[PDB]
Each structure stands twice: as structure tokens, then as C-alpha cells.
């Protein structure tokens, strides 16, 4: 699942918007990335 202290946000007119960090207080249009490879 996604990280502790988030939410997923959605839409204004055409159906766009994705993610917002709640403990920080930051809006975005992507996930926190979260996929390891060397680290």
C-alpha cells in the first residue's frame, strides 16, 4: 500500500489530480515513487 501520513486527491474539470502529503502539507500529481533497485 501507499506511505503513512498521505492522501490521494482527484479532479477539477477534465478528471486530473492524484496525491497530497498530509504530515508535510504538499500537493502533487504523482505517487511518492517508492520502488527500490540499488537502495
Amino acid at each position: 500500500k501507499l506511505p503513512p501520513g498521505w492522501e490521494k486527491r482527484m479532479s477539477r474539470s477534465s478528471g486530473r489530480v492524484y496525491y497530497f502529503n498530509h504530515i508535510t502539507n504538499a500537493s502533487q500529481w504523482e505517487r511518492p515513487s517508492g520502488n527500490s533497485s540499488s537502495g
Binding site: 486527491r9 486530473r16 489530480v17 497530497f20 500537493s27 502533487q28 500529481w29
Partner: peptide, 13 residues
């Protein structure tokens, strides 16, 4: 503080 939700760049129009 009141706010709109902020996308990091913008929508491409």
C-alpha cells in the same frame, strides 16, 4: 491558511 491544490508545473494548455 486557505489554499488551492498545487500541481508542481501546470496542465499543458
Amino acid at each position: 491558511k486557505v489554499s488551492v491544490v498545487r500541481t508542481p508545473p501546470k496542465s499543458p494548455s
